[PDB]
Write a protein that binds this DNA or RNA. Sequence first.
RNA 1: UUACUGCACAGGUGACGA
DNA 2: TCGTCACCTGTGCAGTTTAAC
Length: 758
Amino acid sequence: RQLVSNGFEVNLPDQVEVIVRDLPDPSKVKEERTRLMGYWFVHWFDGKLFHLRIKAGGPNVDGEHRAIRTAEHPWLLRARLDDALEEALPKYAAVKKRPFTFLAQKDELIDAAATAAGLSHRLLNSFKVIPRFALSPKIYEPVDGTTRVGVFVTIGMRYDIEASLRDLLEAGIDLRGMYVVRRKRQPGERGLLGRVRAISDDMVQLFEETDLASVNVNDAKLEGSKENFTRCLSALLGHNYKKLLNALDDQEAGYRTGPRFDDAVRRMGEFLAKKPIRLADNINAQVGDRIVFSNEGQARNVRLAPKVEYVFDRTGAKSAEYAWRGLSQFGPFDRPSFANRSPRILVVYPSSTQGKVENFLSAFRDGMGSNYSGFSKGFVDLMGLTKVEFVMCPVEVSSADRNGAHTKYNSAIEDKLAGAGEVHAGIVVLFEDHARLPDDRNPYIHTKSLLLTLGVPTQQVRMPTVLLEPKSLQYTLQNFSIATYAKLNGTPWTVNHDKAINDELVVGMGLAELSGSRTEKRQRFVGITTVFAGDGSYLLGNVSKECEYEGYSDAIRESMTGILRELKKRNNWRPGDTVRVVFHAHRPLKRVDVASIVFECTREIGSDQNIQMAFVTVSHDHPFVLIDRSERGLEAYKGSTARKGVFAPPRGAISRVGRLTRLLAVNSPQLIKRANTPLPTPLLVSLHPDSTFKDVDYLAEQALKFTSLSWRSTLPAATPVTIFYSERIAELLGRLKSIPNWSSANLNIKLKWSRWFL
RNA sequence: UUACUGCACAGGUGACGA
DNA sequence: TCGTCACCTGTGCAGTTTAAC
Ligand SMILES: [Mg+2]
């Protein structure tokens, strides 16, 4: 039982001698760092300036001399390590600092991919894909109570289009509307300039510009986005360009797949170990063994949570390890009590798509039969309904209509519904050309708004989806049906949980930031999701309808204390019972907000019960990765020699980085998509230090089960639903806030139990 | 906007301190 | 208002014939 990390032990001195002086104003720090450049490493921390001489020779420094033992205060040498790592790799220039980030000197994958595919072109060599390495010194705990410093290795790819803008024109590339960035970067200077309107020899005209409305073609380049790459490439190769991307995919897997990433990390450690890393000209560090997460010795640093169970009844008898297998054999969790067994669903669609939309609906409601066994039975029999009645609502609109599409949809909805009875849900079919119009004329958001105001949740769909070939459609219809059922108030499934306390509430907060363009300043909105422990099951609670970032800490505390009060009345807690409240977000809460939340919650429930509270952040973009060298992977497809998820830790592996932090593996080989899929990154689960409930292994596993609770998809989500649902709610309510005639009035009435945000 | 997954680019932002 | 450590957010494109047996 061992999981290998992407990091190496750093052997450091037991101790280092430093000169300290009080420096209450941190504004003086930058000038002093410049004054002692080259001779002293300088560092501010908690009101005092620390001075570590790294080269003999003045200037000199006042203050108290002090011994800083590395085992007690490893922040000092961790920081010096940032700069020292750069100094030890003089020939690899920093493209970013702390963490030291640099490029491979000779690797360039566009060229290697062209050669291997059999492609060529004069401008190709101006398109570059260069491996990118970062070295992050991090404090970790090899066992509880003892800290050390490791250096963790991560790899990405720099995408850059260095081609002059003049050239791309004369090859046929339409630069109209493409984003453009500076070539020369200056500290404190933005890179994005704006969009491209037209080119007049010397300079290019900008719209949606950040500042300057004009730039010299020599001072600007296309941003190295996938969009710009694909736009330029296919306009010089297609339909051969897909062969390039394939070949590029192949090249990248040579650095990103499990075995290749482990080998790249190994070679990085070997290169870094070959000489001591001077922290001072008489003081050396040394890169050592690859860090491991094991249970060898006095270390208890790796466990494997049990497989999540999908449960489809309240006794626990009907369960499965996959959502779809279990749903297809048992039907939904709430089948015995689901009230509306004959839903009427409004279908809003451009009239010119009538025949394609009828094909889609037949497949949805009545199934695709056993040639497409992913969706044979159809929505009605899948969910145990008696039938579905469609209320067909054609709309006289064409894809070329980019200004009046939304008014046409909404007028047709108004006229159809006025003459009909109540409908319980709606399906809205969208032209691809309309899906991403600005919200003032986007039919997705206007039909969503109109129908949610009226208390009618909608499942929308774009025409390319409606036209998927059947082998793909069957999977689309699994997800479509799960979300639609939940939108009709259904509960498709739960996940197992054995209650060990009398009640447990989990609340999540998610963020959305909305703007009409990148130029425009983004405005923030928030959502709140709640999950309750039931008898053997986690149950989804009610959801926020208000969404302003201002006062979000008050909203968390109001939602928790209101929920605790209703939970106490409903369940009638006994003297001595224990109640647990967990908070989830992608950022940590302020200590002051934790204290406010704890205080109010503690007073609301009172002294008759014991309160346990934990505040948890879930991170996706950290420098840690896990390698399971015992995992050989699975066939890329039945019978193939290629494999996928080689070295991928199993789903539910939990590794201890420190007392407050766990690494959670979510994407197992079974879930990994393709042979070239990179080695996955685990989630980093961090407990807020002021939490009164301290078991972060338990909280990591809880977050695991909540990825399996998403009714957007048959497959688990990338983050627990407490955060994911809140992000979807924040985005939708934030966009709706600016739609004329929107009202939230039905979100707690007709839609109180509808998962209308999926 | 059926989704999951991956990646890229851009924008910056959060928490802790004095 | 700054030092310090950290990584979050939006947008777009592509895929085992992607879709946990
Ligand atoms: Mg949805």
